[PDB]
Amino acid sequence: RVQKEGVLRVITRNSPATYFQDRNGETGFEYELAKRFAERLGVELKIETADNLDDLYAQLSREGGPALAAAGLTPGREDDASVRYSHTYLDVTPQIIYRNGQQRPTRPEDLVGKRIMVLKGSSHAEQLAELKKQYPELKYEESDAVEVVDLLRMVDVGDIDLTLVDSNELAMNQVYFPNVRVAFDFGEARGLAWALPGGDDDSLMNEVNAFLDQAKKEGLLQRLKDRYYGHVDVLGYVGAYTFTQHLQQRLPRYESHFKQSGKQKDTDWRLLAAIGYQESLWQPGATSKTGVRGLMMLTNRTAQAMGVSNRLDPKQSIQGGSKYFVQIRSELPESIKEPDRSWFALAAYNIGGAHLEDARKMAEKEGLNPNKWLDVKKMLPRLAQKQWYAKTRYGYARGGETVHFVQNVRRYYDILTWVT
């Protein structure tokens, strides 16, 4: 149904480990992997999102359902003839997670008597079900309305005692949940794999395993792993002493560019400089595994849109990035007034106008003022909680990092203004 039709249907979940929207559009480990596969087949990729894992598999099991599921799945139900799995493309280990400073369980038996929650329909729920056969007084909860990020949050704040998640999910999310710790590894290391329908037409799964084998030997899987695991997102605030050191050493080299851009766009050059600092620490050669480059950290698409032929040129980067900011600011709803308007533009610069509008709609529904940054800033963190983001048009986003981004830039801006 793919080439003769031209379209590969892939079902996944909306989560930071698989598939989500950022300011540049669709992104995520599974998205990119599936995107590369689609290209290899020379067809168009179309992502479908399941509301939950039972739903994902149920769609995959339907006659005429999606071609495959790319969703951080573990091979399970080895008799469920309705579903077959590919070769593995990422090794993970399931881990019991607890809150730092609380009592650490060390053996499966220690899970008895604790509040545990896992995703409904997950292989981790099945691990607990199996364990419950050996220890019938084991109790655990499963939900369709939470994602792994929510489970880690619940441990972090103590709403639950424990959860059980794959090591890759912890690796990606650990920095955002300072209190959570691995209690112990629960199960042997296993490979993640794509799921395809049963179970007669071997054609697609031949393609899939050939693709995955090549992706490995060719290093794509490693580069995907590096890009999505270990990255910082938004640089943390550097503090007074480091900022002055760069004020001293770096800013004078680019100061004339910021001012000229400020003049041409009739905007405060120090706000432009503050963005540049948050993005690259004023390093015109800065690069990322995420595809951004240069002083203002532009994508190729945005660079091309802004008339930038060389993202590594400080003057072009500053001019293009500044034009992009002012354009975003100019395009905001007229009801948002300065100075809030500039703060919203900073938010959109980082998270994209789509997620920001979701946050404004959520603020309005909450009874808050969608034209006040102080109010909308309170909504952004909710975009990382499935109960809230599943209700939005564009779904999941690490909204709290956008809050940090804006706060950092405003602090640098304030300091630059003071040192004049």
From Swiss-Prot:
One of its GO terms (biological process) is peptidoglycan catabolic process. Residues 1-232 are annotated as: Non-LT domain. SUPFAM superfamilies: Lysozyme-like, Periplasmic binding protein-like II. One of its GO terms (molecular function) is peptidoglycan lytic transglycosylase activity. One of its GO terms (cellular component) is cell outer membrane. It comes from Pseudomonas aeruginosa (strain ATCC 15692 / DSM 22644 / CIP 104116 / JCM 14847 / LMG 12228 / 1C / PRS 101 / PAO1). This is Membrane-bound lytic murein transglycosylase F. The gene is mltF. Its EC number is 4.2.2.n1. It catalyses: Exolytic cleavage of the (1->4)-beta-glycosidic linkage between N-acetylmuramic acid (MurNAc) and N-acetylglucosamine (GlcNAc) residues in peptidoglycan, from either the reducing or the non-reducing ends of the peptidoglycan chains, with concomitant formation of a 1,6-anhydrobond in the MurNAc residue. In the N-terminal section; belongs to the bacterial solute-binding protein 3 family. It is a peripheral membrane protein. The active site is at E279.
